[PDB]
Amino acid sequence: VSPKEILNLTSELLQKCSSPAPGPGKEWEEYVQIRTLVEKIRKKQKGLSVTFDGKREDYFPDLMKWASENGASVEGFEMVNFKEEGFGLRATRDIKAEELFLWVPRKLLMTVESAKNSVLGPLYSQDRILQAMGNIALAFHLLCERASPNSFWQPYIQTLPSEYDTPLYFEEDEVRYLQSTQAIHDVFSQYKNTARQYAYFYKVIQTHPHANKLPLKDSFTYEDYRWAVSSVMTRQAQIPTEDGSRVTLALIPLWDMCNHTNGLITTGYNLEDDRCECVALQDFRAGEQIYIFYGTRSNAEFVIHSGFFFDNNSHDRVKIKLGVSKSDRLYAMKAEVLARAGIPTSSVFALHFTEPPISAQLLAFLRVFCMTEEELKEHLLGDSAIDRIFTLGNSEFPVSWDNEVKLWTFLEDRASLLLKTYKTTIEEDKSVLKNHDLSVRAKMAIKLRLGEKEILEKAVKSAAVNREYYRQQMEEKAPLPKY
Amino acid sequence: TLKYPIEHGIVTNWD
Ligand SMILES: Nc1ncnc2c1ncn2[C@@H]1O[C@H](CSCC[C@H](N)C(=O)O)[C@@H](O)[C@H]1O
């Protein structure tokens, strides 16, 4: 295997992944084509350029000692390899809710600012992609330090996972489970972005003089880049700068070993002490796993960006694209009412699994989307118009009973139409999970596509219920709530 | 509440 063939393949890969989107009908075929080239490149390379002699747990003591010398908490918990979530933190003593049990000073963190002062600093000053995107900057920062045997962050790097469950690691037949869903397009883009970035930075590393001292100039495999971006996207966090004037992306050692459960954010940055602080989300008895709340992310974001599917995700949602048609005779008025309300004429909204399926901004859009001309004028003219705009995203104050009946009728029909665009039904997906033995990555994809349909199904039911409530208030001639 | 709440695995744009 010659370095000339590898650069030929990366050159071919960069041209393929820089081409414009071949249309949504050819994205699956574009995906499989890109996969074929990446696997060819990957089969002619040696995997991870830097590998460590020990098992993952052999390095946790060095991580603990390294974090103690720099002022982090190391007492009260231990690293356990849990079956369900992988490695995590387990409490060695009772920990009461709201107790500050974990803190990490800024010296230990890997940040975009620490990448600027690293060997990657010179190349950072020349490449616009690095400067505009800190996530990629962190990824290459992690790589250069991984290949530096005397890096300050070596104790943390040697404890990272060696593989992930992001879609970048799925087999073709595992991703195939997602055909006809909303989620699969983000899988396509993630794979195409990653391949293009690897090939683009493979050539950048070989052409820029500022990259001559990088360890990546000696070796930089596709497996290196996939591991680094998966490490960043599953773990990274946003913290303030030391100035406090702005934000930056960071890897937080020790803290990032906690796994996810439902709850609230209990991790904040203490600018005075210049350290990350985390208080207990709930009571943790000794011998119980210590969890944190990652954030209010859907299961699609958890699968694609965090590499897992969370059962009982209370913040799950699906996307829905809506817009006011240019062929509508009331387009001008509707766009104007939307503009005065701070709502675009077309947008991607969210349907939630929550008690109301739609947010205040979606409710306001649908109300204007179904307004008569006389209703639009009352939102555009007179001393009461701005007061009408104010209540548009409020379910307690409808425009009229008829406007509500029309908007919930539309939403019931659109969500039903969306359900009919999937290859499978809900009952079919349940039978697959019940009657087949599947890998973890396969179950993620199937549960992902199941969750999309169940959110749409529930939105159909809640839209039908809401249609009947407001149709009742109309036939009974109930007075409209005001102000 | 917290001045700087920290999100584990904050979703960023990759392109
Ligand atoms: N509730 C959960 N269920 C399953 N896996 C989880 C989880 N919360 C976190 N994880 C896993 O933990 C990762 C975030 S980093 C947390 C520590 C990680 N388990 C490790 O061994 O380093 C995710 O990519 C996912 O693989």
Numbering used by the authors:
A (entry chain A): 19 to 501
B (entry chain Y): 66 to 80
Paper text:
Here we elucidate the structural and molecular determinant(s) of target specificity of histidine vs. lysine in the active site of SETD3. To facilitate the methyl transfer reaction, SETD3 provides a local environment that promotes deprotonation of the target nitrogen N3 of histidine (and concomitant protonation of N1).
We hypothesized that the non-conserved Asn255 and its H-bond to the N1 atom of the imidazole ring is important for orienting and shifting the proton from N3-H to N1-H. Substituting Asn255 with alanine (N255A) or valine (N255V) resulted in reduced kcat values of 4.4 h−1 (N255A) or 1.3 h−1 (N255V) from 22 h−1 of wild-type (WT) SETD3, supporting the notion that kcat could be substantially slower if the substrate was a mix of the two protonation states.
